[PDB]
Amino acid sequence: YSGPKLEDGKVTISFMKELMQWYKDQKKLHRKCAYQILVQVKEVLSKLSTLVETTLKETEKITVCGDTHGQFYDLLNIFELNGLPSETNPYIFNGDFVDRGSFSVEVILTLFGFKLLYPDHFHLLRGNHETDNMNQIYGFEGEVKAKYTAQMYELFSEVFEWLPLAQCINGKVLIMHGGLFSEDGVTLDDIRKIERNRQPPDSGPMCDLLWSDPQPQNGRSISKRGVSCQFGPDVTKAFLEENNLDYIIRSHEVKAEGYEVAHGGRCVTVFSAPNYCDQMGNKASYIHLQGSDLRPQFHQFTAVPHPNVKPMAYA
Ligand SMILES: [Mn+2]
Ligand SMILES: [Mn+2]
Numbered sequence: 490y491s492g493p494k495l496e497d498g499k500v501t502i503s504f505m506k507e508l509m510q511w512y513k514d515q516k517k518l519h520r521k522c523a524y525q526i527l528v529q530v531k532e533v534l535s536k537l538s539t540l541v542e543t544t545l546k547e548t549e550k551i552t553v554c555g556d557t558h559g560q561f562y563d564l565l566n567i568f569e570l571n572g573l574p575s576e577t578n579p580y581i582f583n584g585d586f587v588d589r590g591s592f593s594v595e596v597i598l599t600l601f602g603f604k605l606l607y608p609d610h611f612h613l614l615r616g617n618h619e620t621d622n623m624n625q626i627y628g629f630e631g632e633v634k635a636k637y638t639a640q641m642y643e644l645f646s647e648v649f650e651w652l653p654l655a656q657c658i659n660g661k662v663l664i665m666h667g668g669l670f671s672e673d674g675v676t677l678d679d680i681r682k683i684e685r686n687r688q689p690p691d692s693g694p695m696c697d698l699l700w701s702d703p704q705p706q707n708g709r710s711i712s713k714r715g716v717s718c719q720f721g722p723d724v725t726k727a728f729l730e731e732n733n734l735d736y737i738i739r740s741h742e743v744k745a746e747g748y749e750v751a752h753g754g755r756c757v758t759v760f761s762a763p764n765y766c767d768q769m770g771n772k773a774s775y776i777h778l779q780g781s782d783l784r785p786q787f788h789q790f791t792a793v794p795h796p797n798v799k800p801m802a803y804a
Pocket of ligand 2: 618740741
């Protein structure tokens with residue numbers, strides 16, 4: 490084995506750079522190293538609140554990405570466009586790191602790598618595809634069993650259980666993968682109290698955060714996904730007012746342009762997987778926010794070449 494190794498059992502910036510090059514060339518990280526990252530990140534994640542609260546001072550910025558879905562070569566393109574993660578270049582990745590794309594293992598161990606290297610500046614939120622049900626159908630379990638073993642897969646499942654469910658910047662912007670709630674009156678305190686180390690239930694606040702979608706019309710509708718609901722602008726407005734927030738950012742739905750701003754400004758979608766599943770032809774984006782001005786600035790990008798492995802080859 491001539492590949493990437495931890496230094497004194499710990500991630501460093503040169504390990505991350507070597508890892509990204511090894512994966513680019515389609516090589517595999519030794520299982521003992523993969524194991525080391527997974528157990529260390531479980532310990533870092535298990536300490537966090539379900540709601541991560543982050544303060545952006547006035548000269549500080551942060552980058553919010555949406556779904557990446559195993560599109561490793563597009564993940565690399567984000568860091569090329571926008572810079573590597575660092576204490577002065579923080580990132581939030583908003584769920585759905587794995588499934589569908591056939592480089593899910595590469596995406597997730599690079600993200601967990603960076604989370605270990607920059608724990609206060611590199612943030613991962615749980616999406617609905619960081620769950621067993623989804624992984625078993627949409628490729629990630631298949632992929633892990635192929636590259637490692639069922640054991641390694643069970644360890645990834647347990648680490649996903651500790652991913653925080655939402656993030657709040659400056660008590661003003663709330664970020665979550667899916668969206669808002671199927672009942673009125675949920676508060677930031679309620680989110681903070683969710684016991685999140687589990688597979689999500691069929692219903693309730695934890696389920697809604699991962700699974701819900703905005704709709705243009707007022708009210709709530711039964712979801713076309715069969716779980717949670719669609720929520721109208723009136724739901725968003727009431728939630729923002731009670732919680733003293735400006736707007737939300739969520740991901741979870743593919744967008745032709747890479748983003749959407751719904752509910753008159755209040756409900757922004759960001760989606761970071763360009764030409765999704767090699768068929769959608771969509772653009773992707775990420776968002777820049779800054780401490781002196783939290784209004785979203787959208788950056789669009791398109792797909793780069795990747796090796797000839799098809800989407801869901803492992804499902
Ligand atoms: Mn998704
Ligand atoms: Mn999703």
